[PDB]
Amino acid sequence: STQNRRALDLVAAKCYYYHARVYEFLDKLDVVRSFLHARLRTATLRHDADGQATLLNLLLRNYLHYSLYDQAEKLVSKSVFPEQANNNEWARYLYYTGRIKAIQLEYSEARRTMTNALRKAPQHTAVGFKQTVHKLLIVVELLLGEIPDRLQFRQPSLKRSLMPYFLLTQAVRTGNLAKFNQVLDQFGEKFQADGTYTLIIRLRHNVIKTGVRMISLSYSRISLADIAQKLQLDSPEDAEFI
Amino acid sequence: DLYSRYKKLQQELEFLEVQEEYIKDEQKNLKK
Amino acid sequence: AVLQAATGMYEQLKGEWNRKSPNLSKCGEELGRLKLVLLELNFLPTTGTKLTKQQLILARDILEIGAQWSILRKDIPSFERYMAQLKCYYFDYKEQLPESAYMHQLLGLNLLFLLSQNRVAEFHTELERLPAKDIQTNVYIKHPVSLEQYLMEGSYNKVFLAKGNIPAESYTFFIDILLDTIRDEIAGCIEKAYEKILFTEATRILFFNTPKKMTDYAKKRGWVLGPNNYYSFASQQQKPEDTTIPSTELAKQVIEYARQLEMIV
Amino acid sequence: MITSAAGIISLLDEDEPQLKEFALHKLNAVVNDFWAEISESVDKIEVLYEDEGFRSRQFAALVASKVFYHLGAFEESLNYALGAGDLFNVNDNSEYVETIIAKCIDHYTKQCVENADLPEGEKKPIDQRLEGIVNKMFQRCLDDHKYKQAIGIALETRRLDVFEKTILESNDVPGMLAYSLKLCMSLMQNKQFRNKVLRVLVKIYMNLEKPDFINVCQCLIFLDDPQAVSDILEKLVKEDNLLMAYQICFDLYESASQQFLSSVIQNLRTDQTLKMIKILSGEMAIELHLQF
Amino acid sequence: GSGLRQYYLSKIEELQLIVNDKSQNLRRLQAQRNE
Amino acid sequence: RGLAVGIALVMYGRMEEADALIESLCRDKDPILRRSGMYTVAMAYCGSGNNKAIRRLLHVAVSDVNDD
Numbered sequence: 001s002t003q004n005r006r007a008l009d010l011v012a013a014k015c016y017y018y019h020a021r022v023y024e025f026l027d028k029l030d031v032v033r034s035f036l037h038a039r040l041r042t043a044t045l046r047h048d049a050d051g052q053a054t055l056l057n058l059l060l061r062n063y064l065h066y067s068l069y070d071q072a073e074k075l076v077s078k079s080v081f082p083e084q085a086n087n088n089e090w091a092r093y094l095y096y097t098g099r100i101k102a103i104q105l106e107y108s109e110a111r112r113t114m115t116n117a118l119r120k121a122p123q124h125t126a127v128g129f130k131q132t133v134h135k136l137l138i139v140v141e142l143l144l145g146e147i148p149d150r151l152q153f154r155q156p157s158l159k160r161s162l163m164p165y166f167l168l169t170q171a172v173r174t175g176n177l178a179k180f181n182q183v184l185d186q187f188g189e190k191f192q193a194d195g196t197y198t199l200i201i202r203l204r205h206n207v208i209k210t211g212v213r214m215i216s217l218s219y220s221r222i223s224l225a226d227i228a229q230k231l232q233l234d235s236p237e238d239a240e241f242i
Numbered sequence: 243d244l245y246s247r248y249k250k251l252q253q254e255l256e257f258l259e260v261q262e263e264y265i266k267d268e269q270k271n272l273k274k
Numbered sequence: 275a276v277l278q279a280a281t282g283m284y285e286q287l288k289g290e291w292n293r294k295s296p297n298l299s300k301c302g303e304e305l306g307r308l309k310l311v312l313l314e315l316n317f318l319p320t321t322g323t324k325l326t327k328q329q330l331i332l333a334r335d336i337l338e339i340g341a342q343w344s345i346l347r348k349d350i351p352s353f354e355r356y357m358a359q360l361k362c363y364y365f366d367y368k369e370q371l372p373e374s375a376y377m378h379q380l381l382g383l384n385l386l387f388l389l390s391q392n393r394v395a396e397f398h399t400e401l402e403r404l405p406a407k408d409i410q411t412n413v414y415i416k417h418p419v420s421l422e423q424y425l426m427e428g429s430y431n432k433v434f435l436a437k438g439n440i441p442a443e444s445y446t447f448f449i450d451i452l453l454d455t456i457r458d459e460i461a462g463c464i465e466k467a468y469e470k471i472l473f474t475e476a477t478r479i480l481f482f483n484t485p486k487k488m489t490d491y492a493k494k495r496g497w498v499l500g501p502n503n504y505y506s507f508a509s510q511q512q513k514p515e516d517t518t519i520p521s522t523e524l525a526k527q528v529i530e531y532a533r534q535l536e537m538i539v
Numbered sequence: 540m541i542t543s544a545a546g547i548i549s550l551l552d553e554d555e556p557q558l559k560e561f562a563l564h565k566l567n568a569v570v571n572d573f574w575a576e577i578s579e580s581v582d583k584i585e586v587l588y589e590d591e592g593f594r595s596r597q598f599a600a601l602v603a604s605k606v607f608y609h610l611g612a613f614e615e616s617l618n619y620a621l622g623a624g625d626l627f628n629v630n631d632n633s634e635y636v637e638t639i640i641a642k643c644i645d646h647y648t649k650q651c652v653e654n655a656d657l658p659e660g661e662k663k664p665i666d667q668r669l670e671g672i673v674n675k676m677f678q679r680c681l682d683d684h685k686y687k688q689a690i691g692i693a694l695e696t697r698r699l700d701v702f703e704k705t706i707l708e709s710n711d712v713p714g715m716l717a718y719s720l721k722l723c724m725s726l727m728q729n730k731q732f733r734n735k736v737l738r739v740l741v742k743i744y745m746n747l748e749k750p751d752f753i754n755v756c757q758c759l760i761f762l763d764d765p766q767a768v769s770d771i772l773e774k775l776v777k778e779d780n781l782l783m784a785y786q787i788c789f790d791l792y793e794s795a796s797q798q799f800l801s802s803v804i805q806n807l808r809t810d811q812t813l814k815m816i817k818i819l820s821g822e823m824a825i826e827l828h829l830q831f
Numbered sequence: 832g833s834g835l836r837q838y839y840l841s842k843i844e845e846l847q848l849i850v851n852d853k854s855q856n857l858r859r860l861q862a863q864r865n866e
Numbered sequence: 867r868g869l870a871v872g873i874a875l876v877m878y879g880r881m882e883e884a885d886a887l888i889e890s891l892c893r894d895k896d897p898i899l900r901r902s903g904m905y906t907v908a909m910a911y912c913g914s915g916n917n918k919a920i921r922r923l924l925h926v927a928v929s930d931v932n933d934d
Binding site: 244245247248251252254255258259261262265266268269272 | 836839840842843846847849850853854856857860861863864
């Protein structure tokens with residue numbers, strides 16, 4: 001902090017990354033927020049390209065750890081991520097911004113960043129990061145009404161982790177409320193421990209959306225009672241508004 | 243010597259802009 | 275001294291508010307006078323360390339009453355002010371502050387209030403501050419989040435039924451604002467979905483009790499009533515207008531391809 | 540803690556001035572950590588400064604300056620920094636104080652340069668607060684004895700008055716003059732203002748205890764003032780210091796145009812003056828050059 | 832006991848980043864011209 | 867050829883005071899008059915290091931109809 005060297009900025013970014021790690025295991029994550037913000041302004045004013053990128057990622061992790069999604073959205077709205085940043089630092093920013101956009105119902109921009117985050121992730125290591133981004137991208141893809149890629153569930157590393165989401169995607173695909181709910185009462189705790197339970201709840205509207213889409217795509221004229229039966233709704237009058 | 247270093251750097255930046263603009267002009271004419 | 279005094283006029287507000295017929299005026303001045311006292315007693319402490327717990331416990335209470343007092347007279351800016359400070363005493367100092375009994379009821383009021391103002395983007399963010407367990411467990415939290423799913427999925431019938439099963443009597447206000455939005459929304463569904471509907475066929479659809487309540491709403495919506503009690507919604511003729519080729523937009527795009535093929539050098 | 544300052548921000552739209560004043564004193568303690576959301580509520584801070592009857596309207600600008608400074612909108616931050624007035628203590632070592640100081644100098648430097656070539660009628664009067672901090676910025680150089688640094692901003696801001704004062708106040712007057720003269724010819728390009736720098740450089744040179752008449756004439760060739768060069772030469776003989784006048788004479792012919800010398804001859808006519816003419820006319824100088 | 836020494840260093844380091852960026856860019860273009 | 871050198875010498879060390887003549891000469895259809903503008907740029911900007919004058923010379927050097 002006292003020093004003002006230029007090549008130290010490259011070393012300092014690694015020191016900041018581990019300085020948030022010691023408090024990560026200390027489970028405070030709050031005293032470091034003041035230091036990160038103060039260091040970020042110091043790095044931004046000095047045009048510290050590498051330092052600014054790391055501190056922005058660390059701050060976003062800080063805000064997302066305490067579910068301060070409003071705080072992190074404000075930070076990314078004003079702070080400009082360094083274009084000439086590391087690929088490993090860009091990947092975290094794309095994920096953190098993608099997770100931010102996902103909560104703010106900005107699914108379209110979330111999907112672009114999460115897909116970008118996977119591309120810039122390491123090709124052979126950082127498996128845990130890949131699992132976390134894959135889990136969130138599957139939900140965002142389902143939330144957007146699109147379809148998850150079947151290949152990502154075949155990978156040896158992702159097969160065990162994405163299995164609850166694989167069953168979730170299957171339930172959403174059929175557009176059946178009963179099948180979607182069965183996944184919820186079975187993998188509800190896993191989604192909660194995975195930090196994605198809120199976005200799965202929003203998939204209930206999407207399950208209705210896809211199921212209606214096939215009903216219109218397959219039936220020229222379909223009774224409302226038949227629509228309720230096929231979507232496993234409660235009554236035809238509710239399917240009327242739906 | 244701080245001001246001399248600052249002004250010398252300032253003229254170096256402005257000279258580099260001149261060099262990069264002429265190098266773009268020559269590439270345009272070198273294709274012809 | 276002041277802290278021992280601080281709890282003093284709080285019971286005057288607590289006793290008056292807990293009365294079966296509280297007065298909004300005297301409590302308002304009592305609340306208005308109360309907040310000035312808190313400012314000397316470290317109101318909204320920054321980086322709250324181990325200070326006196328009585329000030330933290332007490333300060334939340336007036337905000338809890340003030341937030342609950344705001345909707346009694348049905349004003350929006352007052353609720354936003356009080357709940358903004360109340361959220362500070364619910365998450366920030368929670369390692370010192372004990373879990374408030376009314377904290378879940380008041381937080382769900384904020385969630386239901388956001389749906390009434392159609393600030394759905396802010397609705398999910400504030401729902402994130404809650405732990406994932408009480409989202410599907412606590413009644414005060416389950417009701418607003420379930421209503422949001424009904425609103426987005428189109429279950430408009432269940433939105434009206436949500437009035438009867440509200441978790442608390444404080445919840446009634448924001449339901450009324452939200453119900454007005456639904457009535458305009460479901461009618462918007464009818465114009466684009468229904469080519470023609472019968473006059474009292476829309477009574478249960480619009481959830482209108484008195485048939486006359488259709489007439490004033492019809493002219494506000496400008497609905498053409500037909501001789502057979504049929505509302506004709508012939509408005510799909512305003513198609514996406516494929517009749518016109520966007521030549522200017524098309525020419526702009528194709529020109530840009532030529533730029534990316536020639537302007538590169 | 541205090542992970543949300545929205546409740547503190549909510550204390551800005553009340554009708555009681557004391558309530559708003561307290562929140563301003565609370566926003567400043569968290570402006571370094573929560574400037575993101577305060578940016579969305581700056582419009583509710585700037586009106587507090589805009590209102591004249593507000594007690595802490597100077598404090599409101601200071602808080603508004605900090606959030607803008609964190610935002611990156613330095614032009615708005617400096618404007619509200621000046622609005623704070625005495626509350627923006629420049630002696631503080633904080634990063635905000637020194638960054639706005641840097642931006643204040645840049646804005647003053649751009650404005651002074653723009654005003655420098657502008658006609659006196661169209662001279663936009665510089666903000667008094669902006670000048671005050673820069674003038675106080677000038678003084679810290681003199682107190683810290685950084686005369687070379689003080690010379691640079693003085694030339695950059697075209698402020699010859701401070702430029703005068705730093706050479707005289709400097710311990711090494713000849714050294715500063717030599718360094719200042721080198722900058723004036725190697726770095727300066729405005730010509731019209733470059734002459735002003737040399738113009739005041741003559742004022743110093745005439746005012747040393749032992750005047751360095753050699754450096755005056757070299758500067759005077761740039762100014763193209765044959766009358767001035769005649770005056771210094773004509774008083775040199777009256778002062779009997781003919782030894783220095785002869786050296787001035789050769790230096791004049793070596794590095795001055797014939798027109799500039801031909802004009803000088805006319806004022807010199809208007810004995811020892813004749814040997815002055817013989818040198819400047821040049822026929823002596825070539826004689827040594829021819830003989831060498 | 833420094834004046835604008837920090838201000839000068841901020842100015843000098845600001846220009847250095849642009850100068851280094853432009854110098855690297857110019858060397859890219861000069862090779863293109865030479866080829 | 868004699869005039870081209872002569873025109874430049876009249877405006878020697880004139881800084882920007884030769885800008886009006888320089889654009890007139892450099893825009894001329896006569897190759898020699900264009901050559902005079904280059905010489906006029908040199909004499910109006912002797913040792914001034916004016917990158918604006920250098921900007922014009924380099925443009926003409928790489929893009930001009932006449933090799934002279």
